């Protein structure tokens, strides 16, 4: 139907919270996704 | 209560390097957000670097990394510096200041430098 | 009261599973048995006419 | 503390007869894990044990 890109700048360590069913506190206090979600998570190095 | 006090005053001719003290007295040191500062005669402050003796790790400022040196002995609860490459306009008043600190202590939540030194 | 919904739901689904297979268990005994005392009622009632 | 117990030996405190507030605990930024297993770590403060 429509596509929706959420975009933002995390921690390293913090990247495997952002999926399903996860905790901490970037995945309770800041970018919660739900548990029934269909999409992609793309993460790439930025350091540069 | 608590307070800072460093070493006296010394005159090094220039291209020499300078080693100043910071003894700590009273209170739960290596919790303390130790800073280093100083003023030019006439000009504002400036900064060139700051350490947390628990962390272990020291900051520095651009215009002074690589030249000076900072440690925090926890043994004694003092903080050293080492400052080299000394030149005509690096002479100045040298301050040691803290910070108290609450909080989880790894995440920046911190009082103000209620506390300075008397110079150097 | 222990677990948050997202394990929550694997935990309930299981007892979901089991009471579900429990209770589908219950019924078709209950029309099996059914089954025979329908069959018995006929012979009560025929014998009763 | 600062006598943390070797693995081979490690250390066993057991904490009885107390009210555990497990938001200080929870709701420190300190740790870097805080994985919880069989219960959730957001309910915990509602539990006894």
């Known amino acids: 139907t429509n596509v929706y890109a959420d975009s933002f700048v995390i921690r390293g360590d913090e990247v495997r919270q952002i999926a399903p069913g996860q905790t901490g506190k970037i995945a309770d206090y800041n970018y919660k996704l739900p548990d029934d979600f269909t999409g992609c998570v793309i993460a790439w190095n930025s350091n540069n | 209560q608590v307070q800072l006090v460093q070493s006296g005053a010394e005159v090094k001719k220039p291209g020499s390097s300078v080693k100043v003290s910071c003894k700590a007295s009273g209170g739960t040191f290596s919790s303390y957000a130790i800073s280093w500062v100083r003023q030019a005669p006439g000009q504002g402050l400036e900064w060139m670097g700051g350490?947390?003796?628990?962390?272990?790790?020291?900051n520095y400022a651009q215009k002074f990394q690589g030249r000076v040196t900072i440690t925090a002995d926890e043994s004694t609860s003092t903080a050293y510096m080492e400052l080299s490459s000394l030149r005509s306009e690096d002479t100045a008043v040298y301050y040691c200041?803290?910070?108290?600190?609450?909080?989880?202590?790894?995440?920046?939540?911190?009082?103000?430098?209620?506390?300075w030194g008397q110079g150097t | 009261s222990r677990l948050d919904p997202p394990e929550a739901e694997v935990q309930i689904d299981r007892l979901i599973t089991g009471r579900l297979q429990s209770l589908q268990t219950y019924v078709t005994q209950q029309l099996i048995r059914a089954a025979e005392i329908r069959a018995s009622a006929n012979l009560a009632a025929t014998k009763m006419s | 503390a600062t006598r943390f117990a070797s693995v081979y030996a490690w250390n066993r405190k057991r904490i009885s007869n107390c009210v555990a507030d497990y938001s200080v605990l929870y709701n420190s930024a300190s740790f870097s894990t805080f994985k919880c297993y069989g219960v959730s770590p957001t309910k915990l403060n509602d539990l006894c044990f």
């Open positions: 350490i947390i003796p628990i962390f272990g790790t020291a």
């Open positions: 200041a803290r910070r108290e600190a609450y909080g989880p202590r790894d995440y920046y939540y911190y009082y103000g430098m209620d506390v």
